[PDB]
Each structure stands twice: as structure tokens, then as C-alpha cells.
């Protein structure tokens, strides 16, 4: 994504967010029951001598739903939490088991 | 298209609209490497495919003019003015008699 004017590189979507479309001015935030965890995503670093940025790794395109037996309640997150005794989650992508 | 997750269930239960269950691992349609089917787990529909019917052995392919970006979508998303989708290779699965 990119939200500024006159940029030489785009910005990598962070963990907990995704950019599904093309040319987004903002990154979409993962919703409860989903998560994005891309650990290699990074922003370009500007070579202070030549003023050219090099290292960009893109983030996630789509959010991963929580697996069966796991759930997620907060929106911007990078993990799924297995819920405790007395509760179950038999579907993928549950906001509360 | 059917599953049973606990012992002694009276009847097979149908996979919910967003999911599917194939005949086996070998004859399964789009289904990733490590995923195996043993009759206890309905699997979501890959991005670009969708499903809206209960108890289906395969997901349906999104048509030209629409897209599916998330996983396990009951319905396909319609392309909006300013954009389009044209995949000429998209095709539904054909059934053997």
C-alpha cells in the first residue's frame, strides 16, 4: 500500500493487515475470526548516499481464518487462541467459539 | 459431501455452504499439499472458488465478471465499476455418470 504523495516505492502491509486490491491508499485490517502473520514483510530502506530504496517484501493479500478448535476475537492480530474447557469451535474462522 | 466428527452420530451431516468434502485425497479437486480428507473435516473453498450449496464434493469456480478473495465464501463478489475480471480458463467440475 501507499498513502503519501510522490513516493519511489510502495509500503509493505504489516502483520495483522492485508491489501487485497491494487493501488490501495490504506491497508485493510483483519477482522475477528481471521489473522495475517507474514514475518518476512519489510519496508524499503533508503540508501543515504544514492537516495534509492532497495528492500521491499510485500505483506498478505488475504487473511487466514482461524482453524477448527481455535478462535479470534480481536481485529488486528497475528495469531489464533485455542479456547478453554467447556467450549468448542467446529468451524474455520469463528469470532468466538 | 458429508462428514461425522463424533462417535455414534445417527446420520451423516452435510458440509456447510462455504465448505466442501471430496471423495478422497487422490481424486480431490483444488486442495493443498498437506491437507488430507478422512470424513471428519469439511474444507473451505480456495480463493477464486466459491460454494453456496450443502453437501458438495467440489467448490464452484467464480465466473468472469466476479471474483472471490476470501476463503469459504458462500457467494462470489461482483466486480465494481472501474474494474473487471476475465479468466478464460475458469470452469466448473464436470461429473462422471
Amino acid at each position: 500500500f501507499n498513502d503519501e504523495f510522490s513516493q519511489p516505492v510502495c509500503k509493505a502491509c504489516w502483520s495483522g493487515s492485508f491489501a487485497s486490491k491494487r493501488g490501495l491508499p490504506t491497508c485493510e485490517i483483519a477482522q475477528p475470526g481471521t489473522f495475517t502473520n507474514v514475518a518476512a514483510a519489510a519496508n524499503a530502506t533508503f540508501n543515504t548516499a544514492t537516495l534509492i530504496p532497495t528492500g521491499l517484501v510485500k505483506g498478505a493479500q488475504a487473511p487466514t481464518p482461524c482453524g477448527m478448535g481455535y478462535f479470534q476475537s480481536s481485529a488486528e492480530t497475528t495469531t489464533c487462541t485455542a479456547c478453554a474447557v467447556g467450549t468448542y469451535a467446529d468451524q474455520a474462522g469463528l469470532a468466538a467459539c | 459431501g458429508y462428514y461425522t466428527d463424533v462417535d455414534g452420530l445417527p446420520i451423516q451431516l452435510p458440509c456447510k455452504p462455504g465448505t466442501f468434502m471430496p471423495f478422497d485425497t487422490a481424486t480431490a479437486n483444488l486442495l493443498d499439499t498437506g491437507l488430507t480428507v478422512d470424513g471428519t473435516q469439511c474444507y473451505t473453498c480456495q480463493t477464486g472458488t466459491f460454494n453456496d450449496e450443502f453437501s458438495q464434493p467440489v467448490c464452484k469456480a467464480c465466473w468472469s465478471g466476479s471474483f472471490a478473495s476470501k476463503r469459504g465464501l458462500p457467494t462470489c463478489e461482483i466486480a465494481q465499476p472501474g474494474t473487471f475480471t476475465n479468466v478464460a480458463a475458469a470452469a466448473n467440475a464436470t461429473f462422471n455418470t
Binding site: F35, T36, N37, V38, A60, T64, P65, G67, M68, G69, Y70, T78, T79, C80, Q91, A92 | T19, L30, L31, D32, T33, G34, L35, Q41, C42, Y43, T44, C45, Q46, T47, R71, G72
Partner: peptide
């Protein structure tokens, strides 16, 4: 990540 097709980001 059980029941999740197309695989996904590791937890």
C-alpha cells in the same frame, strides 16, 4: 490451521 484450505500464514 485445521480445515483451512489453500493453507495460510503460520500462527
Amino acid at each position: 490451521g485445521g480445515g483451512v484450505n489453500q493453507n495460510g500464514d503460520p500462527v
